[PDB]
From Swiss-Prot, chain A:
A GO cellular component annotation in the UniProt record: Cul3-RING ubiquitin ligase complex
PROSITE patterns per UniProt: BTB, MATH
MF-aspect GO terms: identical protein binding; molecular function inhibitor activity; ubiquitin protein ligase binding
InterPro entries: BACK_BPM_SPOP, BTB/POZ_dom, MATH/TRAF_dom, SKP1/BTB/POZ_sf, SPOP_C, TRAF-like
Assembly with partners or alone: Interacts with GLI2 and GLI3. Homodimer and homooligomer. Heterodimer with SPOPL. Each dimer interacts with two CUL3 molecules. Part of cullin-RING-based BCR (BTB-CUL3-RBX1) E3 ubiquitin-protein ligase complexes that contain CUL3 and homodimeric SPOP, or the heterodimer formed by SPOP and SPOPL, plus a target protein, such as MACROH2A1, PDX1/IPF1, BMI1, BRMS1 and DAXX. Interacts with IRF1; this interaction mediates IRF1 proteasomal degradation. Interacts with HNF1A.
Organism: Homo sapiens
Name this polypeptide is given: Speckle-type POZ protein
Region Important for homodimerization: start-end pairs: 170-201, 281-339
Lineage start: Eukaryota, Metazoa, Chordata, Craniata, Vertebrata
Keywords, alphabetical: Cytoplasm, Host-virus interaction, Intellectual disability, Nucleus, Ubl conjugation pathway
Function (record text): Component of a cullin-RING-based BCR (BTB-CUL3-RBX1) E3 ubiquitin-protein ligase complex that mediates the ubiquitination of target proteins, leading most often to their proteasomal degradation. In complex with CUL3, involved in ubiquitination and proteasomal degradation of BRMS1, DAXX, PDX1/IPF1, GLI2 and GLI3. In complex with CUL3, involved in ubiquitination of MACROH2A1 and BMI1; this does not lead to their proteasomal degradation. Inhibits transcriptional activation of PDX1/IPF1 targets, such as insulin, by promoting PDX1/IPF1 degradation.
Swiss-Prot record, chain D:
The organism's place on the tree of life at top rank: Eukaryota
Disease with which this protein is associated in UniProt: Nabais Sa-de Vries syndrome 1: An autosomal dominant disorder characterized by global developmental delay, impaired intellectual development, speech delay, and variable behavioral abnormalities. Affected individuals show congenital microcephaly and dysmorphic facial features, including round face, small palpebral fissures, highly arched eyebrows, and short nose.
Assembly with partners or alone: Interacts with GLI2 and GLI3. Homodimer and homooligomer. Heterodimer with SPOPL. Each dimer interacts with two CUL3 molecules. Part of cullin-RING-based BCR (BTB-CUL3-RBX1) E3 ubiquitin-protein ligase complexes that contain CUL3 and homodimeric SPOP, or the heterodimer formed by SPOP and SPOPL, plus a target protein, such as MACROH2A1, PDX1/IPF1, BMI1, BRMS1 and DAXX. Interacts with IRF1; this interaction mediates IRF1 proteasomal degradation. Interacts with HNF1A.
UniProt source species: Homo sapiens
Tissue: Widely expressed.
Comment, domains: The BTB (POZ) domain mediates dimerization and interaction with CUL3.
Location of this fragment in the whole protein: 16 to 108 of 374
Family: Belongs to the Tdpoz family.
Subcellular location: Nucleus; Nucleus speckle; Cytoplasm
Name of the protein described by the UniProt record: Speckle-type POZ protein
Name of encoding gene: SPOP
Amino acid sequence: PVAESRCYTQIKVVKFSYMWTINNFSFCREEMGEVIKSSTFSSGANDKLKWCLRVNPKGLDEESKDYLSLYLLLVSCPKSEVRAKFKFSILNAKGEETKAMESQRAYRFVQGKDWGFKKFIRRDFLLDEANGLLPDDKLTLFCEVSVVQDSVNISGQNTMNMVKVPECRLADELGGLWENSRFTDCCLCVAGQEFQAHKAILAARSPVFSAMFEHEMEESKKNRVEINDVEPEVFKEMMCFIYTGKAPNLDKMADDLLAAADKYALERLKVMCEDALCSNLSVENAAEILILADLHSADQLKTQAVDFINYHASDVLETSGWKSMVVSHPHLVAEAYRSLASAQCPF
Amino acid sequence: GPVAESRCYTQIKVVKFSYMWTINNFSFCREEMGEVIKSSTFSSGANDKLKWCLRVNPKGLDEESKDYLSLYLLLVSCPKSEVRAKFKFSILNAKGEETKAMESQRAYRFVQGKDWGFKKFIRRDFLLDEANGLLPDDKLTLFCEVSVVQDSVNISGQNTMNMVKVPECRLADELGGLWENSRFTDCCLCVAGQEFQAHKAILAARSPVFSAMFEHEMEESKKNRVEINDVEPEVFKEMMCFIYTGKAPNLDKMADDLLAAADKYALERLKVMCEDALCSNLSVENAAEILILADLHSADQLKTQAVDFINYHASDVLETSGWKSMVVSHPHLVAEAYRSLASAQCPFL
Amino acid sequence: VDFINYHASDVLETSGWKSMVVSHPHLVAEAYRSLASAQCPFL
Amino acid sequence: GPVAESRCYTQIKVVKFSYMWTINNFSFCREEMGEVIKSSTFSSGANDKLKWCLRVNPKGLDEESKDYLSLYLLLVSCPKSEVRAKFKFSILN
Amino acid sequence: PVAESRCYTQIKVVKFSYMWTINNFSFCREEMGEVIKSSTFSSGANDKLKWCLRVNPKGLDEESKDYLSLYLLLVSCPKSEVRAKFKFSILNAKGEETKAMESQRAYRFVQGKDWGFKKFIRRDFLLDEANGLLPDDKLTLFCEVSVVQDSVNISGQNTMNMVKVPECRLADELGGLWENSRFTDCCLCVAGQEFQAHKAILAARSPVFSAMFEHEMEESKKNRVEINDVEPEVFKEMMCFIYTGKAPNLDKMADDLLAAADKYALERLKVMCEDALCSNLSVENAAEILILADLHSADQLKTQAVDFINYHASDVLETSGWKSMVVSHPHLVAEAYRSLASAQCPFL
Amino acid sequence: SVVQDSVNISGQNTMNMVKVPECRLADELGGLWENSRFTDCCLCVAGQEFQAHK
Amino acid sequence: VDFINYHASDVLETSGWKSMVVSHPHLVAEAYRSLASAQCPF
Amino acid sequence: VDFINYHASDVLETSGWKSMVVSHPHLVAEAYRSLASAQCPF
């Protein structure tokens, strides 16, 4: 029953690493194996199959109760199985790898499937200052990952080439318009702060700025335009996104960025702000989250916040933010009831 | 020991299909050792962009399969995704029933274009016999059963179905509309007499050459009626398309001229894709003028690729007349090719 | 509140609901506490 | 004799799937027969517009299932196209 | 391992019929039992489920060689099961059913499968003139395909909730507009025969007619516009499809109608002109069909015509039509080489 | 195990078929309505003007 | 004829192919006639 | 030709070689043809 191939098989490995520091490790306090779920990250080269790390401060199962179990996770993929190999390492106080252990074989990965190592490191040993594994009580773990591709024969051309194709570095020079400042073509004012930018890119990247400037205000206000519902700090990252399409410091002032976004209908900035505000699903935010939602019509954020509120209602109700928001905006809890009843009409 | 559990459920997802292949007058399908003949491609219908095709050999390969008919299953195309699958080849008799239905021990690993099957699938001599009822009027009719397995997951708990969704970037398409709409254009790009127009800051920040020729402190005169000479309309419009949205669809058919334009315009990225196109269009005759282009245009990656290809294909490329023309006109190119082959694959011994 | 929680799927449809809830919200909050705090935290 | 043969061979299409409705604290689920509690709506993923949901009782309907649990499977939504499916039940111990 | 639905169900049948006939049954002579096939046809309502009839002039193998079997094969469907019922019956010389044979149950149907009765009718008896079953050597069969649907209590309120709605009679409405010709505005003429119409609706269907009426030319044009490409009969049917779009007599008036359609760029009815020419791919017509298709950009029929010619080349190429063709327009065969060389197993 | 009972064939085409689109008539009548495209009538709705084709 | 059938793919972009097609079409027609029995199986 | 083929890696580093190739490229083309068969296997 054996069958050969009569063809040549070749293996590639496009590897990548993701370090992470968990600040205030001693007072993380996610017990009973409650996940301290990491922040997701992509593959770098061919960012089309995302990743995220799944971590137990207290190792799951009572066998690893004294240990801090670590297990890699896969969040999203285009419906396929990955065969990636991985490595772990803990950095000491000086930032040098100490606790290195490597997977002997390449475990099979599927979306929602997890592999890794139990008994990664004893909790008290990690908490001991003699080992030096907790600089500023910041538990740092350096993870190296390697994805195996394994195509066959490279086709019948041998395709050596090399031909280094970097990305389309638009945003680098498109921001070079800003930092070099290139004797640009229009001006902005924010509490007297002098900003100096280009009409054409603002026209291109949204209908709002395009329409308003060319609606008779480009004539008398070709250069100097007044914007007053914004602060210079949030404005900085906002116009940085208008340059780049990717905001470096987005999550810090995310709510005000959302305010500016819905003020200018920047749908991509709106959805990153939805995701960033979704980073902070807590039992003491949901009122202000709904204020941001209805004030800005954040549909996906509205849905996710409503569902989390329905799940966490018992703790949610005790907030004075809840009764204050209900006093100001009962109607919002009316659609919240519309959702929860829709979840439980039958029975 | 060193292991990796899951603390989840490993759930196996599988859907199967089957297909048949008819060959009328298989006896008249040529008769000698190793004549690979393929099947028309096919699909189940719920394949989700995935095809299959068979590879039957009437007389096989190797040595002792002279009196045997081997069969294989080749994956035509897929969305660059790994595949694992199971198959079972069968033969419809004269009365229309599976006879030679043998299944593999397990589901095999698969990739795009990889062939699996059953060597020595059926002995040819007994199949030639008409008593077995396997060839009614030499109208051979195969039939295979295939069980593709996926092993994805699904679960009810954890309330994690909606974690937010994000669309993909539209800056390039927004720059695409900026090209197409061409609103607030500030520089009237004249090529081959006919007129196009563009926006200042885009090309001002794009390339060193363009930035150089506007920063000469005399803009408003020339920018209104800038004259551009060496380029043609097709090359320049595709150039502007690439500068705006980073895409040049007809690169393969417009390679060398765009390469020359980028060399004049000093555009590294488009130059490199032009090098990629020229290297991935190579023939046994074009290589000499490609060397002339490369040395005339600093196509270093294309230069090393082309001279390596010519060093490999010497025994027929040297007989080309264009090679001798390049030899006469451009001695330094053949000199560097001689240098390249010198300290390689011959310092012995 | 028990009857409303049981028969929500059609009791929403009344216009008197809209008139009452816009006019007086605190009993809507009472309904949300009653339905959510119990006979629901399962999952 | 009376027959209408299909003039074709027999080819059959089958799709496998499994779904896990996990329920915590089942022992306090409003224990009285005749109640309706169901799983969240699910599907194969390669379904081509065909969903499913599982249905269980705290106490089985009627009287023969006074002590037993009555389990049922409902097709949530379909394009008004008939389905032939073979289901199976079990428990994660 | 059993259960019950705990729900109510009811049977419904949206049935219909389909007249169909073929010419010259005496010397059809499709030996070996090769299929003589009807055209695609639906039930009316739910037009996206199409039936067709497959017929054996000679039943397969010796068991049915001397009889003539009858069957019906689904063309295509939206990937769903069907449990249809069918009735087969040929009309006698008086136009009445005599050879009525009926299936005893509703069989199950899938795309590509056919159901019917082998050993259907006594062939020589049907061919004999004494019985009076082939008037003018014509077999006017009349099938009544009754398709059953069934459902679970129609999402049960019951509360029937539905009155018998008529259907949108827009085609019949514009049919009444033209065929009775009330309220006419613009006058046309071909070959001495005159007709008249409404400008705006013609502009609605035709872009080009709007173009040669949008540019202020109405004072001399509207009263006395003449058309040259089309003769009065096909002109009648021409106006007919602009009013109607349901092609009544495409078959016998197919080719020049296609030509005049592409003369006015009539897109969906261009497509149904390729439908009209689709089911006549024969041993001699193919060269003319290919020539007119490439003269008139019939892309889908271009592909299928070159496919049919490519398959049957070995005997189809010998006709004099091919000779005059390659004498006149052999670059068409160059395009044929371009297609088939990168196709049909380029071995080799 | 959800059964569907599908059928496939080795070779196909022969007479075959060609993809016909659904009837695109009507909503070009809508085009007449909205663009108004050589109007033919005048209407009044409490003075609110409107036009159509007779 | 046989070698041109075997190499039709890269023969197409040859300018001489279109040249003889324009000038001597019946020749490539007879090349098709050769191709008729050539590709009977599959 | 053979000696230069053997010692190319430092023989080509001479100014005389540069003057020869620019003045007489055809000779190095002949050497290139000679080494084409030499470097064929791989």
